[PDB]
Structure formats: C-alpha cells, structure tokens
Amino acid sequence: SGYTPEEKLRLQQLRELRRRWLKDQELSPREPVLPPQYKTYRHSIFAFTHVLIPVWIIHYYLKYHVTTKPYTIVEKKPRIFPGDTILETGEVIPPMKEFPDQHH
Amino acid sequence: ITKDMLPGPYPKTPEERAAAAKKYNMRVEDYEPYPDDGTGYGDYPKLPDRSQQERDPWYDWDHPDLRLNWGEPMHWDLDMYIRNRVDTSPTPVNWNLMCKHLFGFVAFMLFMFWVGETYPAYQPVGPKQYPYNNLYLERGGDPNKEPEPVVHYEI
Amino acid sequence: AYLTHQQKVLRLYKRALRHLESWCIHRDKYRYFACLLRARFDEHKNEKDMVKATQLLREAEEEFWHGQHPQPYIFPESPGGTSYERYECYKVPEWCLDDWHPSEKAMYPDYFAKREQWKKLRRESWEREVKQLQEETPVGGPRTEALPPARKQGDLPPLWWHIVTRPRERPM
Amino acid sequence: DSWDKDVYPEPPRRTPAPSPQTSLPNPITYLTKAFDLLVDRPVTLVREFIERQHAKNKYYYYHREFRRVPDITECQEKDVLCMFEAEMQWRRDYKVDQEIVNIIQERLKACQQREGESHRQNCAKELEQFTQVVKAYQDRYHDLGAHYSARKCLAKQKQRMLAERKAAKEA
Amino acid sequence: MNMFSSLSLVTLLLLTMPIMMMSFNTYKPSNYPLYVKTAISYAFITSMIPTMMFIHSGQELIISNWHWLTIQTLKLSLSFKMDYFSMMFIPVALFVTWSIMEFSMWYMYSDPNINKFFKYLLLFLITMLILVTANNLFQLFIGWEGVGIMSFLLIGWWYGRADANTAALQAILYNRIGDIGFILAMAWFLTNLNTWDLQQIFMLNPSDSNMPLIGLALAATGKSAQFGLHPWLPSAMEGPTPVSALLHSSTMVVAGIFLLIRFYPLTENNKYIQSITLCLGAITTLFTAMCALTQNDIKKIIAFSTSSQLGLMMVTIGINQPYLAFLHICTHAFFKAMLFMCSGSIIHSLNDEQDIRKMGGLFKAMPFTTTALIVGSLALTGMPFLTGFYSKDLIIEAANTSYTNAWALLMTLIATSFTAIYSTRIIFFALLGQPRFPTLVNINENNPLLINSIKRLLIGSLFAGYIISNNIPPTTIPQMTMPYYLKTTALIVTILGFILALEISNMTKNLKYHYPSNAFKFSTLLGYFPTIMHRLAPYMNLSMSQKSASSLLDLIWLEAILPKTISLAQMKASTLVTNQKGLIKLYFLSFLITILISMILFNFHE
Amino acid sequence: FPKYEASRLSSLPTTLDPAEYDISSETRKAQAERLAIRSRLKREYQLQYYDPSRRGVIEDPALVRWTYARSANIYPNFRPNTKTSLLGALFGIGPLVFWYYVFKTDRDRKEKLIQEGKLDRTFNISY
Amino acid sequence: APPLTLEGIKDRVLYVLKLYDKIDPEKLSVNSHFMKDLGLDSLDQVEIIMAMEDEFGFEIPDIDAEKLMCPQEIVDYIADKKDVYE
Numbered sequence A: 001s002g003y004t005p006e007e008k009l010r011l012q013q014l015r016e017l018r019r020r021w022l023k024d025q026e027l028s029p030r031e032p033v034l035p036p037q038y039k040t041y042r043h044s045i046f047a048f049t050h051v052l053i054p055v056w057i058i059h060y061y062l063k064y065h066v067t068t069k070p071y072t073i074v075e076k077k078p079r080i081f082p083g084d085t086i087l088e089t090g091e092v093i094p095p096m097k098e099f100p101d102q103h104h
Numbered sequence B: 001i002t003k004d005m006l007p008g009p010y011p012k013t014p015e016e017r018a019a020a021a022k023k024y025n026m027r028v029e030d031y032e033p034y035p036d037d038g039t040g041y042g043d044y045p046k047l048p049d050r051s052q053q054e055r056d057p058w059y060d061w062d063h064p065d066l067r068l069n070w071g072e073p074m075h076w077d078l079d080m081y082i083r084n085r086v087d088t089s090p091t092p093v094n095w096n097l098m099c100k101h102l103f104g105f106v107a108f109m110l111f112m113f114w115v116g117e118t119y120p121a122y123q124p125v126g127p128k129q130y131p132y133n134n135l136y137l138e139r140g141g142d143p144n145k146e147p148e149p150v151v152h153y154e155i
Numbered sequence C: 001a002y003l004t005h006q007q008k009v010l011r012l013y014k015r016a017l018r019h020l021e022s023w024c025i026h027r028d029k030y031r032y033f034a035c036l037l038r039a040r041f042d043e044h045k046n047e048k049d050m051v052k053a054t055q056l057l058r059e060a061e062e063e064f065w066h067g068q069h070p071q072p073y074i075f076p077e078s079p080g081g082t083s084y085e086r087y088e089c090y091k092v093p094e095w096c097l098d099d100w101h102p103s104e105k106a107m108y109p110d111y112f113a114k115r116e117q118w119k120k121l122r123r124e125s126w127e128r129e130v131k132q133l134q135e136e137t138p139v140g141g142p143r144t145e146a147l148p149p150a151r152k153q154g155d156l157p158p159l160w161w162h163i164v165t166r167p168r169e170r171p172m
Numbered sequence D: 001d002s003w004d005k006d007v008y009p010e011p012p013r014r015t016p017a018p019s020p021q022t023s024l025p026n027p028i029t030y031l032t033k034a035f036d037l038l039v040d041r042p043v044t045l046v047r048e049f050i051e052r053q054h055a056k057n058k059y060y061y062y063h064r065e066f067r068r069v070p071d072i073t074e075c076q077e078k079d080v081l082c083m084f085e086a087e088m089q090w091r092r093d094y095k096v097d098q099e100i101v102n103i104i105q106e107r108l109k110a111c112q113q114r115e116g117e118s119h120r121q122n123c124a125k126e127l128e129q130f131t132q133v134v135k136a137y138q139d140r141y142h143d144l145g146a147h148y149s150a151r152k153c154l155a156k157q158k159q160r161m162l163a164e165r166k167a168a169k170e171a
Numbered sequence E: 001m002n003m004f005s006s007l008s009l010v011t012l013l014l015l016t017m018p019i020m021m022m023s024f025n026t027y028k029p030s031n032y033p034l035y036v037k038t039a040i041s042y043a044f045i046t047s048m049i050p051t052m053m054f055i056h057s058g059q060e061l062i063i064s065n066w067h068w069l070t071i072q073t074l075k076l077s078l079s080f081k082m083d084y085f086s087m088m089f090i091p092v093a094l095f096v097t098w099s100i101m102e103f104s105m106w107y108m109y110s111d112p113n114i115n116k117f118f119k120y121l122l123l124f125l126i127t128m129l130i131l132v133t134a135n136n137l138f139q140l141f142i143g144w145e146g147v148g149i150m151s152f153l154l155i156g157w158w159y160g161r162a163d164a165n166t167a168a169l170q171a172i173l174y175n176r177i178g179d180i181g182f183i184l185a186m187a188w189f190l191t192n193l194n195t196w197d198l199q200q201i202f203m204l205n206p207s208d209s210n211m212p213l214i215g216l217a218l219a220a221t222g223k224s225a226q227f228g229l230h231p232w233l234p235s236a237m238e239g240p241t242p243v244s245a246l247l248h249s250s251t252m253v254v255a256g257i258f259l260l261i262r263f264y265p266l267t268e269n270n271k272y273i274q275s276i277t278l279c280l281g282a283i284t285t286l287f288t289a290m291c292a293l294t295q296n297d298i299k300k301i302i303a304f305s306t307s308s309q310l311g312l313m314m315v316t317i318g319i320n321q322p323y324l325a326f327l328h329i330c331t332h333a334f335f336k337a338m339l340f341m342c343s344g345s346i347i348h349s350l351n352d353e354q355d356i357r358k359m360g361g362l363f364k365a366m367p368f369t370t371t372a373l374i375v376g377s378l379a380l381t382g383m384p385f386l387t388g389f390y391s392k393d394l395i396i397e398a399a400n401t402s403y404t405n406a407w408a409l410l411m412t413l414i415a416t417s418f419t420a421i422y423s424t425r426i427i428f429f430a431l432l433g434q435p436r437f438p439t440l441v442n443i444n445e446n447n448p449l450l451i452n453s454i455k456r457l458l459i460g461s462l463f464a465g466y467i468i469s470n471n472i473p474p475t476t477i478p479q480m481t482m483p484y485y486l487k488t489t490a491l492i493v494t495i496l497g498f499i500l501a502l503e504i505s506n507m508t509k510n511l512k513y514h515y516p517s518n519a520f521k522f523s524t525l526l527g528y529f530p531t532i533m534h535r536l537a538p539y540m541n542l543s544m545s546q547k548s549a550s551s552l553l554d555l556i557w558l559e560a561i562l563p564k565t566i567s568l569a570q571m572k573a574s575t576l577v578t579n580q581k582g583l584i585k586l587y588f589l590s591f592l593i594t595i596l597i598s599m600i601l602f603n604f605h606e
Numbered sequence F: 001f002p003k004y005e006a007s008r009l010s011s012l013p014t015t016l017d018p019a020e021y022d023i024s025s026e027t028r029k030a031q032a033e034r035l036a037i038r039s040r041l042k043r044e045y046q047l048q049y050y051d052p053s054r055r056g057v058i059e060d061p062a063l064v065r066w067t068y069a070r071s072a073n074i075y076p077n078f079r080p081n082t083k084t085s086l087l088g089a090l091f092g093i094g095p096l097v098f099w100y101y102v103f104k105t106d107r108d109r110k111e112k113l114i115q116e117g118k119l120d121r122t123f124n125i126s127y
Numbered sequence G: 001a002p003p004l005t006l007e008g009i010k011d012r013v014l015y016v017l018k019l020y021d022k023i024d025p026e027k028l029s030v031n032s033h034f035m036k037d038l039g040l041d042s043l044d045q046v047e048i049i050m051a052m053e054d055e056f057g058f059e060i061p062d063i064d065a066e067k068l069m070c071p072q073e074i075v076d077y078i079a080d081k082k083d084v085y086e
C-alpha cells in the first residue's frame, strides 16, 4: 500500500528543498539591522501624569464650570437620624421615643 | 470570457445538453439543468444541495477555506453554503426525532409553568402590615383627603 | 466510491477505535475494549466471498452509526478541533515581501540576499518544469493529480515553489 | 452664585455633624485633607491667576430683547408682510416654551435624586407643576406636524375653544 | 461632593488615557500591555475612594456635566449615576479586570498582536463602565452596543478561522434581536413619559408598564443569553481564554441582568413581568445546567455554568429581589473569572488541549492551579462562607419562601443540584486519576504573572463575599424565619449532587459498555436547539433572500411590469408605423379614408 | 438500529448509502473520468499559479459563469406562467396588502380613541 | 513548546515501536518495512499510526497514513508537517 518509487522520489526532492528553505528563514546575527535611534520613581511619574494631572483638570472643570450651572451635580441629601446635630443651623434632632427595650 | 462560455437558455436537445455539460466542465451524464419552469435558471447545472462544510477537509483544495477547486462549477447557492452559513452534514440523531424531542421538551415545560402559576407556592403567613393607614401618605396618596382608615391589631 | 474494500474496512477500524476511545476515556478500559474490537475484525479477516465480506462491512457501518459518540474527541488542530485554522491569520504569502519598502528590506540584508537566490532558482528552472510536464502527460491531459519527480541532475520536481515556500505551521 | 435660585430652587442643606462612635481613624477624613492640599489648593491658585487676567479685560454682552409685534390673529389673510412678523414671533415663543418645559423637567429630576427613597412624597409639588406645564404645552403645540405654523396653532386653538363652548352649552 | 465627584470621573478618564495614547502615537510600545494593566490597577484604587464614601454615609450623586443635544423638550446630557449599583460594581469589575489583564500578559505573550488585544480589552471595559453608570437610556445604549461590538471583535480574534467568524457574527445576531426590545423600551418611554432619563421615569412611575418592561426583558434575554437567545454564549468560547473570563464575569453577559436591576422601581410593581422573568430564568438555569452535564470541552462546561448562573439571577429578578441579584453579579465575577483563568492555565500547559478526556492526573502536577480550581468550584456550589455563599444561599431561601410559581422554584432547585454535578466533572476528569495527555510533558505554572493574577482572585473568592455583605446598607427586609427544610434546601441538594456526581463519575472506570440513552444525546447536543435553529432559520431566510426578494421580484417582476413591458409596446408600435411599402397608391388611398372619417365620424367639417 | 432518515438539512452519510458499495465497472468508469476532469482543470490552474512571471488574478471562468448566471441570465430565461405569476403575486402584493390592513386597522382604532378622549396622552408631547 | 528535531522525532518514533509487543526491538531499524521485514499486517499498521498520532498529538489523515510503511517514512512525514529542518 505504501509509496510508489516515483512518489517516494518526488517527496525526497521536495524535502531537500523545503528544509533548505526553512533553514534560510533563520536570521543572521546582525539582523535586524536597526537604523539609528527604580520602581518608586517609575510609579511616581505614573501617579503624577495619570492621576494627579487628570484630577487637577477634572476638579478645575467641575468646580468652575459644571457646578456653576444649575442641577449639573445633584447629590442625594444626607440621611438625618434622631440625635443628629445639623451643621448648617446647629439644630438638634430630637431622639426617638422610648422603646419597650425588649431583648432576646 | 467570451459569449460562448457564459450561461445560456435551458438546453432543449441532446446536442445542447452536451454543449452545456462541456461548458460547465461536467460530464454529460452528471449534468442536470434545473427544471424549465420559467424561473430563470437557464442551463446552469443543478448540483447536490450540500454545504461546503461537507467536503473533505484533508484534500488539497485550490480554495481551502471555501473547499472549492478552480474551474469546478459552483453551486447556484454557493454563497449560502459557505462554511459560515447553512450546514447540511449528517447528524447523529435523525432530524425528525430531533424536532420531536426539542418541541416536546419546550411544550412540556410551558405546560408545567402554566400549572405552577395556577398552584403557586407560598408560606402560611398573613399579609405584611404597614403603619399609618398602610403608608398612605408615603406612597403618594393625596394629603387633602382623609384615607379609608386601616387598623392593624396585636395577636 | 473510489476507495477499495480494504481501504473502507481499515478506515472503519480506525474510526471505530477513536469513538470507542471517546466512550472509554480511561486508558486501561480503552485497551481492554480495543482488543475485543480487534478480535471482531480478526474473526472475519480471511472471509473470501466478496459478497459476504461486503455485507459484513455494511452491518459494521450500521452498528458504528448507532453506537458512535455524539461528541467524539478531535485533535485540537484537526478539522473541527478547537485550534483548527487558528494560525491562518498569521500566514502571509512570501510574495508580499516584494512590496516591502527599501528601508524595510535594508533591515534584513542577509535574508533578502538568500531570497533573491531562491527567486533566481525559480526562474531558471521554470522552463524545464513546463517542458517535463508537457512530455510526460498523455494527450487529453492528465488522468490523475499526481506529479512526477525530477529525472535529471539539476532538474527540480515540477511545480515545487508553493510546496517548498509555503508558510510555516507556526509563523508568528 | 451664577444662576438664579428662584428659577432653579434647592431646599436648604442639612448635613449632620460627625458623631464618631469608633476609636478607629476615618480614612475619608485624611483623604479629604489630602485632596484639599494636593488638588483644591493648586487648582484654586491657577483659577485665581486666571481671574486676575479677566479683571484687566472686562467687557459685556447682552440678552436680546424682542419687542412684541401683532399676532397672527391680527393679520389680514394672505398679507405676508404682517404674517411674516407674527409667524417669526410665534416661532420664537415656541422655542422659549420648549425651554420652559425643560426647566420644569429639570426641577423634577433634581428633586427625585435629591430626596432619595422619600421622593414619592417629597416631590409631589414638582410632579404637579410638571403635569400642569406639560398639559399647557400639549394644548398649544401637540399634533401640529412638521410644517407647523402660527396659522395651524390658531386653528387648533379655535377647535379647542369651540368644543369648550359646546360642553358648557350642555351644562 | 468635590472629592467624590472628582474621583469618580478620573476613574473613567484614567481608563481612556491608554486609548488616547495609542490612537495619538505618544506611547512607548515596549510594554504597552503593562501600561494598560498598570492604569487599570490605578483606576481600581481611585474607584475605592468614592465607594468608601458611599459605604460611610450612603452618599450618592448624579453628574450631568455636558449638555450634548436638546430635541425640543428632550434635553440629552452626558450624565453619570454614581449610586449604589455603580459604586460597588465598578471596583469589582476593575479588580477582576486587573487580574485578567495580568493573566493575559502571560497567556497572550506569544501573540504578535498582543498590544491590539490589550487595547480591545480596555475598550471592552470602557464600554461596560459607560453602560453601568449611564443615567439616561441613550447613554446606556451607547455602552449597550459598545460591549456588543467589542464582543464581536474579540470573539473573532483568530479571524483566519471560519468557526471564530461564525461565532462572532452569531453573538451580534442574537444580541441584535435582543436590542429590538431595547429600542422598544426607548420609544415607549419617550412617547409616554417624554424622557429617556432614569429619574423622570421613576418619578412618573408608569402603572401600565407591560410594554416597556417586556421590551427590557427581551433586551436582557439576548445580552444575558437566556433561553431562546442563549446559544451564542457557549459559542463565544471561540475567543482567547482571557476574553471568556472577562466576557463572562464582568462586561457583556451581566449587562442584561444589570439592566433589569436598574429598572426595579418599575418591575417591583408589575407582577406580570415578575412571572415572565421568573419562568424565563428557571428554564434557562435548568436547561443550561443540564447541557453542561455532558460537555467535554472545558471552556464550554464553564460557559454553560455562566448561562445557568445568569438564569439564576433572572429568577432573583423574577421574585422581586433586585439587590440579591446584584450581589450575585458581584460575587459571581470573582470565582467565575478565576475558573476561566484556571482552565486557561491547564489548556496552556497541555499545548492548547481543551477536552477533559485528555487531561487527568493534574492534581499534583499543577498544585496552584488545582487549589484555585477547587476554591472556585466550592464557591460556585455555595460552600458555606465562601464568596458564592453570600449571594446564592440568600437567593434560594428567598425563593422558596416567596409567593412564586411552583414549577420555577422546583426547576431552580434541581439546577442547584446540577451545579454540583458538572463542577464535580471538571475536578474529577481534569485533576484526578491518571494522566491522559501526550507523552511530552510540559506542565509549568511557575510564571509570576500567572500566580499573582490568580492569587488575587483566589483571595477574592474567599473573602470578597463576606466583605461586601457586611458593608452594603440594607435595602429590603431579609426573610430570616422559615422551616428548617427551607433553610437548608440549597445546602442539601448541593451535597446530593456531589454524591450522585461522584457515583456517576466512578462508574466510567468500570469495564462495561452501555449504548447511549436518548437523554444523553439530548444533553450532549444542547437539546438540538443549535442543530435545528442554526440550520433551519438561516436556510429559510437565505433562500428567500435569493429566490424571492432578489430573483422573483427585483430581477423579474419589477422589470417585467414596467420597463420591459413599456419598451416592448413602443417597439411593436414602431414597426407598425414604419413598415410601409413606399407606394404612392397606398399612401393616397389612406388620405381618402382620413378625409372621409374626418367628416362621417368626427364632423370636423361642422 | 433505526434507519437513517435523511432530511434537507441533515444529509445521508456515505457509509450508510447503498450507492457507495456494490460498485460496478460502470461506476468505476464514471469516477475515472470525473477524476480526469478535475486533474485537467488542476493542471491548467497550476501551470498559471506556479508561473514565476505571473502577477495578477487567475481569472476563473467558473466563478464568472456563477455570478453571471445569478444576475444577467435570469430575465432572458424568465417565462410568465402559472408558477411565476402566482409566486410573484403572493410574495410581491401579498405582504404589502397584509401590512396595510395591519397598520390601517391599528391607526384607525387609535384615532377613534383620541377623538373621544379615551387614549392616555398625559405626558406625550414629543412626536 | 520545545522545538522538535529530526533526531528528536526519530527517537520517539522508535521509542513507541519498541513498546509494541508485535515488533522485535532487536530486528527493528528506521528502514524496517512493517510488512516485509517486521511481518505485521494492515490492521496492525493502523494501530501504529494511531499510536504516533497520540504520541505527537496530531492526526494523520487516512490517505496519508496508509502510505507510511517504515519508521523513516513516519519520521519524514512528521518533520514535514511540523516544519522541522534541523
């Protein structure tokens, strides 16, 4: 069932050529012939250029442009609980009424 | 190409069936036009309706991705049978049985969901109770109407 | 069908072994059932009546279809496997290097010097390859897709360029 | 500040005073101080510099006032010269009314966010004011089509006024 | 407000800077992958500050910075909702993406286009963050389709492979069908509420919300790959493993569930929507878990697990528990991304082998991958006090104590049992027994990129669920009273799944051959849904496109009834007019006829 | 063993097709000349594909016939008959009449409700 | 992966055959024809090719496999498919 002698011979001759071709794909020592052309400090300039400069720009943008227009930044108002003291007015929020203080 | 090599009308005579088969690089025995029903097929050969996914992967096709050879007649629906689209390869399970089991599964599940909606599961618990006339004011009720009082008692 | 009776039985043997291996999974269990399956094939090895042999093959195929694995094992780079054609996007034909800018070619002076020799070898051999094919092909074209070797010293096997220079299986 | 508090109202702010019940330090407190020093301060100085330049070049721009011209009701039919002015006026008032509905919608959306989980009851006034303004806007301008005009608006009003007369006639 | 608002925007701006640098040739492409990974790590840190402020006081805000377009009475502004869902999902998504990106540096090292790969991963993330912080529906749509397109580009990464292009286009097709519902919801809200803003939608609180919510459910059905539009998610395994980890934990598949969570103020009042989502979730979770029982591709097993977990989330929506569904999104991200990175570690070590039948004996050969796989499997199955337990267990006991469809509840419980079965399949067949892989052993999990990335997600799969649950404010009334058999249901059925799975697994080692059952083939071939639908629907549509639309109508009947008929008549009339004998006698004989009929018939002389 | 039931989208495996087996010298003759046509077309392609001096596209008449057969050749071979006219009427006029009554009926209902005041349009001011 | 070599491939091809109980490991050489020298049959040859697929982890199509009748041919086929040139 195997190869015929003609089949074997053609494979033999292609094989020599293919292996020579693959060998020629190897790069020479000088190639490629390029044309003319520690963590802390490395991590510091990243924080500077990617965190501080952007937050500077964004804070300036929000503080003097976005927040000077109505309803651009809308916060949910703080939760007020009994016993809290309001900073704006100093009003003291009354405590809740006495519980049955039942425990279990 | 020249006009003699392009598709033509439905072949009427055995001499025209032999010219069409030669034109399409087919054997006259293997050449079969579409039926002459006036739908516009002309003499373009009718080839078996099989996906390109069905062809031998290991053969050295001139167009390996398409699994076509240069010069062979392309199926009328070749673009529908590329390996990205309709597949016709044999299945381990018969097509009709496959449909029965898929439909049967889906119909049964839909039936059982209807039953489960008729007989819902729930806990042996009375309704949850809320204060202040069932939170009438909180839920947006009108403050200018005195609501139908709702009273909840202890137990 | 262009496969002989022998080629069909041998193919059915390998295919049934692979699907058996997919059911068994564990190597020891596979070895046990691969030998029972081999015994079945050996049991009719000498069947002489071609008519009875063909009927045996027909039944074996029917049995294989009934018992095949719905999800058989496929080698990753085989057709249907999970890595089939994964690297086709990285295979770039060699002729694309002719379009490289000179500043790109100057980066690999040694590689492109060899490449020129290969292109020279392709031109100088082409005529003999065409002539050899013409003189070994019967009238009315070839009857098979087989090709001859080179018959002389310095002759290259006709139609070799795209076999020899095809992209590597792992180009990038 | 910059906008009118009456056009864009905001209830008084009531922030509770810190009442730490833990010995641990609050990370937010020290992050806030770092933010003021490293972000707010240098940003503020850069702005104060820019404001010093804008004070040296002070110049003004004005809000265009449009005198009232006769409406399309006063225009003799097919009198284009008077129709044109009334039509241009009607289109100016149409755009302004669109922005009025936007102001009322912006009040409504601000209230819903501000009130949190209590919005369903604490934004009933803004819901009502939005409902009334949207009803008025719909009466004026709805269903006029792409080729709307003062003439079509008048025809819509007259049709509405006729129905109102008839409904009263029933009473 | 100044720090909260400022920091919550730098996070989003920080992630775009690698994109701007790449697109604007101002980068050192030496180690661009490391640059992108570093930026993600820094975004995670800056995102924690807003989250801590929310944890402290529940501080939330909406930022409407840029007015983009006003269409009459519909003002559209670029807005960002920094609320409960935004402030907890973002740090989780960034933390998981931080590991996936470090892992991908090792896993895609040999890729010649690794730089482009990391750019696409970053765009995938940016479009998900746009989606999750969107305050109006138009901004949400931008991110909704952004993740859909990045999914197309990454699934079809190896574009020379026909299967990768079919799978990629399949994802677009199924997600575009879902997008019909998104467009429907937008149109209804604009028409009936005059808004695309989430605040106005909730303030007006429509009562007849059947149509908008059905559209929202249809959109979620496609994006979250629920039954009906489900086959694309397993097919998305064509992509590189880092894509699968990110596409399954964060980004795409969770967007569908997130969209329904965002609209819980509407769904919480519409019972009819709750029933539909519940049944849609229950069939999905059961059907896909059933499919995973017999898969042999390790990525497909994990892929069907995601489908079954998303189905569980839809059930949670269906029982009016949006916050538990959100918690499952957050906890699921940890151990599911870890599981995919563990499978990638195995696949890489066995020369891109993905079939579990060719693994085995890796328990001792890959110790750290083994540990992460077991931790990820136990977390997936609701092992007490691992990250998965803090969402899944509360969901099950909130579902059997609800007023709920009984079939959906029962189907959900069986799926929990099936979860333990396919999980046992991966551990039994990949880690245990004797090796079944080729003879040239190359196992090696000793790269620090691989170890550190998995280690962080391993710490997350242990403690993240505990941390999140103890820091999120309560927004419901947790139902903590129930009979013992409802409390421990999830735990028991899970244990039964492990025991049944172990017996089934051990019986593969017996020397007995058994013909496949009908149910075995149904599970293996995914209920035949892809086999039938992906041949029948393309065939009918594609055949109609050519035979009828293109041939019958365009090339025949529209030609025949106008240009071909009109021109034929003109030709016939021309031959009648011009075919004359040139005979004087005939022309003048016709003159006499004309004069006669001019008088006799038409009275032109009167 | 239940027999294989072939469908349009689930073809018959060759290993189960009787035509594959019981081969005659007449079938082996057909295969030989089929393989000849393929071999002759392959040689014609290879002689051009391998030509060093060729730079361009190897024009394929089979592709040209296919694109021409599915465009320019359709009308010349069209015949108005019972089949084409019924199909043309069904798929050309059919859908248009269908969608007309769907939209006309739906829009007539809506207009009627709007006239009486029974259609909710409380916040509908964008159109 | 660790690159293959012609000597590397040859060693493993012979390694597998030496573990096949129907081949005498002392009469075996890279040039041994499976039928003529080693006395195997075709059913055996299918198993040998099946064992080389498992060994090197890739499939050899049946049309190619049936022609590999000596260990050197298997070595040559594998090196060709894997671009091994040494």
Ligand SMILES: CCCCCCCCCCCCO[C@@H]1O[C@H](CO)[C@@H](O[C@H]2O[C@H](CO)[C@@H](O)[C@H](O)[C@H]2O)[C@H](O)[C@H]1O
Pocket (backbone or CB within 6 Å): B100, B101, B104, B105, B108, E414, E518
């Ligand atoms: C834990 C799982 C929870 C969910 C369980 C859901 C169960 C769903 C069961 C659906 C079963 C439907 O599938 C049903 O199977 C039988 C057996 O083949 C089919 O019947 C078919 O098989 C045999 C022949 O092979 C014959 O009985 C019959 O001629 C044929 O039609 C039915 O036509 C089909 O309707």
Ligand SMILES: CCCCCCCCCCCCO[C@@H]1O[C@H](CO)[C@@H](O[C@H]2O[C@H](CO)[C@@H](O)[C@H](O)[C@H]2O)[C@H](O)[C@H]1O
Pocket (backbone or CB within 6 Å): A042, A045, A046, A049, A050, A053, A054, A057, E021, E026, E027, E028, E029, E030, E031, E032, E033, E034, E035, E036, E038
């Ligand atoms: C509207 C934008 C507002 C903010 C504008 C700020 C612009 C500042 C840009 C600074 C440089 C950005 O572009 C890029 O940054 C990174 C990090 O420094 C550098 O990248 C460097 O660090 C990273 C990781 O630390 C390494 O992976 C990389 O090998 C190295 O080159 C690139 O060399 C530089 O080209």
Ligand SMILES: CCCCCCCCCCCCO[C@@H]1O[C@H](CO)[C@@H](O[C@H]2O[C@H](CO)[C@@H](O)[C@H](O)[C@H]2O)[C@H](O)[C@H]1O
Pocket (backbone or CB within 6 Å): E381, E382, E383, E384, E491, E494, E495, E498, E499, E502, E503, E506
């Ligand atoms: C919420 C997470 C819950 C995780 C639960 C984890 C699994 C719980 C235990 C499952 C059952 C334990 O396994 C039980 O004991 C031993 C294993 O020790 C098994 O014993 C088995 O050993 C060998 C394996 O070498 C098998 O080939 C053999 O068939 C069988 O006897 C039993 O068949 C099984 O009944």
Ligand SMILES: CCCCCCCCCCCCO[C@@H]1O[C@H](CO)[C@@H](O[C@H]2O[C@H](CO)[C@@H](O)[C@H](O)[C@H]2O)[C@H](O)[C@H]1O
Pocket (backbone or CB within 6 Å): E562, E563, E564, E566, E567, F075
């Ligand atoms: C629908 C509203 C307006 C419709 C107005 C249409 C008027 C007709 C415009 C095109 C006029 C072209 O007039 C003529 O048409 C026929 C086909 O139609 C062309 O002829 C071509 O098709 C015919 C029949 O299909 C063939 O017999 C002929 O071999 C071929 O050349 C002529 O080359 C062109 O000269």
Ligand SMILES: CCCCCCCCCCCCO[C@@H]1O[C@H](CO)[C@@H](O[C@H]2O[C@H](CO)[C@@H](O)[C@H](O)[C@H]2O)[C@H](O)[C@H]1O
Pocket (backbone or CB within 6 Å): E566, E567, E568, E570, E571
């Ligand atoms: C709504 C009003 C529309 C007004 C449109 C303007 C009408 C212009 C009329 C142009 C008439 C001439 O158009 C004429 O059509 C016939 C179509 O049979 C063409 O004829 C072509 O087809 C016929 C049969 O199909 C062949 O016999 C003929 O060999 C071929 O050339 C003529 O080559 C062309 O000259």
